[PDB]
């Protein structure tokens, strides 16, 4: 009665936003950046190798001081590493071994980890007793925790497998916002530089840009053919990039509302597990599933480097906040720090 | 070389490595069983026999420590978290034997045991369990012996040229389950015919997984 006319209205106004995106495409990124010079072969080298995990490494997060990191593996361990000296600063035994994400607070006081137990645990790194213990257990998702990021020492945005993102306050433990609107399992989120928006990617090939304070889906981005596994903001916050299982990265814009550039090579068949941007945004580092970690010229979409040092799937990666190095963790239980030489 | 605090930090990191390695060996002597099947096929019966995210059950038997992971409550997409169980010791796939003629409720046109063969085909030749042996439980056969005498097996099986007795029907069901195994060189299926009144199912999973453990230790020494 009303559902048929309502879905015809739905098709009508989403063709309206399709033609509105089509009205803005004056030119694409390729013939705009066809005049600028390429970056050359990005020759990077392994510097450290962080050994000590005894299962697959699922997530790493760089500290904001660009020296510490946290890594999560399914041997039940969250390891705080000093990346300069390869020292293990802390070893955190988790209650649930099935961890799929880890986060480092931007103050350095806390780490969050979440997995198949649907709980996002917050750990106090700097306590008076000397050890690390559980500050908070954010329970309230009904699917697996697939990502988590901190905004403060108090406000944390999570993605779950029950199609919802959430925004939690830690000192109460309750959700202050529930971001709903995805139809598939949400796999990744990426906070903006000013922490007022965040993009998210799910298994229905959708990247939803949310406003954190109003709690509403600002924009929705399509273009991929399968599950989007990782997402990352451009460093000025006016664009972002997704990596999906159809062997393709894409770069959408928050203002122009559409995809500008696609990162795909015919030699790659496998999925993409991680994407991250360099400090200038010129290089997009996508950790693929053919055991390599490719490095793309993010303005011209030609492949400029390969980081091939792992014996398994490059599962997580991350660039430091000062952009010195790139840590890739993989399913062969080995984190590797990378950068080039003059 | 290093400062005094750097050297005490390196000593702390060595203590971290020592506790990591001894915990990792204590965990490598663990039996991690992924529990799979359909809804109420005897899963609660076998989990009380062996004593909304994941449900892990830890127990011990004959000084061997078992952890068993039930992922039935996880209504998420299975193609995004099943590789977390790539590397379990065995998969306990549970199937009731009395569901060869009964029909599912959602479709009312497919057979229940045909749905069990579809699920066993999805679990057995999966790409993350090519090396994982599949313990196969076949449950409540004491009601199957009453259902096989009145109702024939030929409803489910067209190409059944066998008798309607108990042991021939059970052997035919077991061979039709074990013949979906498309990689029969790397894994092997261990089959058990159990009831509600038997005491020897945890003994079966102990013996079967002792076989899996000894074959794994043979493959890591070099004797395989």
């Amino acid at each position, epitope marked *: 009665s009303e559902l048929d006319q309502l879905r015809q209205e739905a098709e009508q106004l989403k063709n309206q936003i399709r033609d509105a995106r089509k009205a803005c495409a004056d030119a694409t990124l390729s013939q705009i950046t066809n005049n600028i010079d390429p970056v050359g072969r990005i020759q990077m080298r392994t510097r450290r190798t962080l050994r000590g995990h005894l299962a697959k490494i699922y997530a790493m997060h760089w500290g904001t001081d660009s020296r510490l990191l946290v890594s999560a593996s399914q041997d039940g361990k969250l390891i705080i590493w000093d990346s300069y000296t390869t020292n293990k600063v802390h070893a955190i035994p988790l209650r649930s071994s099935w961890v799929m994400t880890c986060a480092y607070a931007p103050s350095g006081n806390y780490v969050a980890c979440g997995g198949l137990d649907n709980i996002c645990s917050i750990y106090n790194l700097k306590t008076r007793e*000397g*050890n690390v213990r559980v500050s908070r257990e954010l329970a309230g998702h009904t699917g697996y925790l697939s990502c988590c990021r901190f905004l403060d020492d108090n406000q944390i945005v999570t993605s779950s497998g029950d199609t919802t993102c959430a925004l939690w306050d830690i000192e109460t433990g309750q959700q202050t916002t529930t971001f709903t609107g995805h139809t598939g399992d949400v796999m990744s989120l990426s906070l903006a530089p000013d922490t007022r928006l965040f993009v998210s990617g799910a298994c229905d090939a959708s990247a939803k840009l949310w406003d954190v304070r109003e709690g509403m889906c600002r924009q929705t981005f399509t273009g991929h053919e399968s599950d989007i596994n990782a997402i990352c903001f451009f460093p000025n916050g006016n664009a972002f990039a997704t990596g999906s299982d159809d062997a393709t990265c894409r770069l959408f814009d928050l203002r122009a509302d559409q995809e500008l550039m696609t990162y795909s090579h015919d030699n790659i068949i496998c999925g993409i597990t991680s994407v991250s941007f360099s400090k200038s945004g010129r290089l997009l580092l996508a950790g693929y599933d053919d055991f390599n970690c490719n490095v793309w010229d993010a303005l011209k979409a030609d492949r400029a480097g390969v980081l091939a040092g792992h014996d398994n799937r490059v599962s997580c990666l991350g660039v430091t906040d000062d952009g010195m190095a790139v840590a890739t963790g993989s399913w062969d239980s080995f984190l590797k720090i990378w950068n080039g030489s003059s | 070389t290093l*400062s005094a605090e750097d050297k005490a930090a390196v000593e*702390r990191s060595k203590m971290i490595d020592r506790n990591l390695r001894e915990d990792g060996e204590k965990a490598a002597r663990e039996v991690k069983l992924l529990l799979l099947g359909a809804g109420e096929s005897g899963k609660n019966t076998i989990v009380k026999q062996m004593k909304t995210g994941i449900v892990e059950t830890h127990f011990t038997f004959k000084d061997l420590h078992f952890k068993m992971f039930d992922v039935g409550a996880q209504r998420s997409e299975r193609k995004k978290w099943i590789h977390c169980f790539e590397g379990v010791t065995a998969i306990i796939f549970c199937v009731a034997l009395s569901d060869y003629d009964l029909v599912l409720a959602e479709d009312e046109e497919m057979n229940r045991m045909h749905a069990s063969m579809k699920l066993f085909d999805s679990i057995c030749n999966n790409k993350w369990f090519t090396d994982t042996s599949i313990i196969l439980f076949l449950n409540k056969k004491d009601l199957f012996e009453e259902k096989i005498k009145k109702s024939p097996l030929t409803i489910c099986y067209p190409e059944y040229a066998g008798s309607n007795t108990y042991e021939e029907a059970a052997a035919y069901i077991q061979c039709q389950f074990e013949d979906l195994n498309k990689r029969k060189d790397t894994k092997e299926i261990y089959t058990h015919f159990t009831c509600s009144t038997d005491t020897k199912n945890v003994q079966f999973v102990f013996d079967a997984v002792t076989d899996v453990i000894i074959k794994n230790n043979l493959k890591d020494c070099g004797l395989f």
Partner: single-chain antibody, 231 residues
């Protein structure tokens, strides 16, 4: 709360032996290296001994190397100093000191209440032994070292401590700049090379006491002679 209580001290004959116990409570005692630091009556502090986490490193002062034995009991949460050949110089007050070492750590952070025993290198230049002041004005306590504590190893291992009268010492600054936990932001630490300073602006009445600069660049650990703040 964190707590370290010491026992065993008292009157002994010279040349004898005595057991000093430091019972720990309220912190991960196995994760912390421990020190003994003593203070002779109306004198400064001198580091005595150091046992590491898991007893994998035991350092002594050459005054007591061979005569003292430091040993921790982690299941009982106790620290022990066995004292052999006690001369009349060893009349002091002993402090059992937690210290943990990783990146960004705060060593020497909680000192025990100490016990009194009565029986009958890099040098820190802390020459100004008394600075008289009234509350409300900024004071600058200076300290100099024999060699530099800063190079390409990265840090500058100078530790400012404060001892209020009738109390244990308390960490103010570690690694020359970083303020400790539980101390206000008016305390500042600065310096370069061999010359360092502690600034106490907006000074209140509870900053009366003796202030010590310590080095942690290499063993043995040496303090300053003290700098008294009074009135």
């Amino acid at each position: 709360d964190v707590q370290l209580v010491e026992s065993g001290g008292g009157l002994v004959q010279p040349g004898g032996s005595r057991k000093l116990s430091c019972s720990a409570s309220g912190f991960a005692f196995s994760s912390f290296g421990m020190h003994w630091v003593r203070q002779a009556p109306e004198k400064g502090l001198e580091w005595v001994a150091y046992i590491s986490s898991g007893s994998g490193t035991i350092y002594y002062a050459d005054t007591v190397k061979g005569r003292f034995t430091i040993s921790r009991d982690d299941p009982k949460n106790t620290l022990f100093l066995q004292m052999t050949s006690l001369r009349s110089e060893d009349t002091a007050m002993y402090y059992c000191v937690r210290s943990i070492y990783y990146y960004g750590s705060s060593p020497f952070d909680f000192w025990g209440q100490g016990t009194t025993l009565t029986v009958s290198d890099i040098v820190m230049t802390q020459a100004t032994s008394s600075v008289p002041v009234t509350p409300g004005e900024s004071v600058s306590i200076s300290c100099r070292s024999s060699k530099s504590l800063l190079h390409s190893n990265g840090n500058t291992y100078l530790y400012w401590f404060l001892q209020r009268p009738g109390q244990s010492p308390q960490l103010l600054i570690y690694r020359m700049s970083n303020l400790a936990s539980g101390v206000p932001d008016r305390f500042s630490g600065s310096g370069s090379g061999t010359a360092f300073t502690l600034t106490i602006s907006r000074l209140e009445a509870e900053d009366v006491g003796v202030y010590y600069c310590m080095q942690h660049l290499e063993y043995p650990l040496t303090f300053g002679a003290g700098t008294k703040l009074e009135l």
